[PDB]
UniProtKB/Swiss-Prot annotation:
This is Serine protease 1. It is found in: Secreted, Extracellular space. It comes from Bos taurus. The keyword Secreted applies. Is inhibited by scorpion cyclotide trypsin inhibitor TopI1.
Amino acid sequence: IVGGYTCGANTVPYQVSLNSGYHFCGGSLINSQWVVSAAHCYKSGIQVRLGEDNINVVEGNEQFISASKSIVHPSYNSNTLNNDIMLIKLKSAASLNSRVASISLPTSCASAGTQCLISGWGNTKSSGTSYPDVLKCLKAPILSDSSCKSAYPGQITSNMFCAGYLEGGKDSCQGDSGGPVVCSGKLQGIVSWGSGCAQKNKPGVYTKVCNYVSWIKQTIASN
């Protein structure tokens, strides 16, 4: 997260870290057994880390649970990042508490201008590299689809939306991928892609979760 703020320990209790010997992506707990992330975060041997603040220090509220299965969206296209969504099942159910909590799925899209919370452990610099140990947060508004498509001509599908600031300086970044965009108490987005980070007229692009709720519910119920 570039241009954000320190969230505060466990203030985003649905935020998970995906770990394969190191943090590599975020995700969101949607029920005690299931995490949603980005398809481009797929790999084998994922351990889900819940209740994290400092990802480098055991602080006492963590749950580390291996994934039993990963399901990439059937239509995921790694060339265009269309349908950049995947589900991860926990080998054992997470223990829900004040610091480990699920985030509700949306019933409809969110309007342009709605304020959202984006979070993750990704790079905090727009030109250099500096990775934080504690969770970072950003309030960012949903941008109009027209401004999103104007910024990325030929590359935005109906399964993507933009959020952030056209003036630059505030954006998600590498290492935030797969993490949440939450608006009005619902998981509206997944950190997906963008042109650099926090650059002018190149806002963050996010998977449009509301388009996938039917697939999420059917897939979880069958797996």
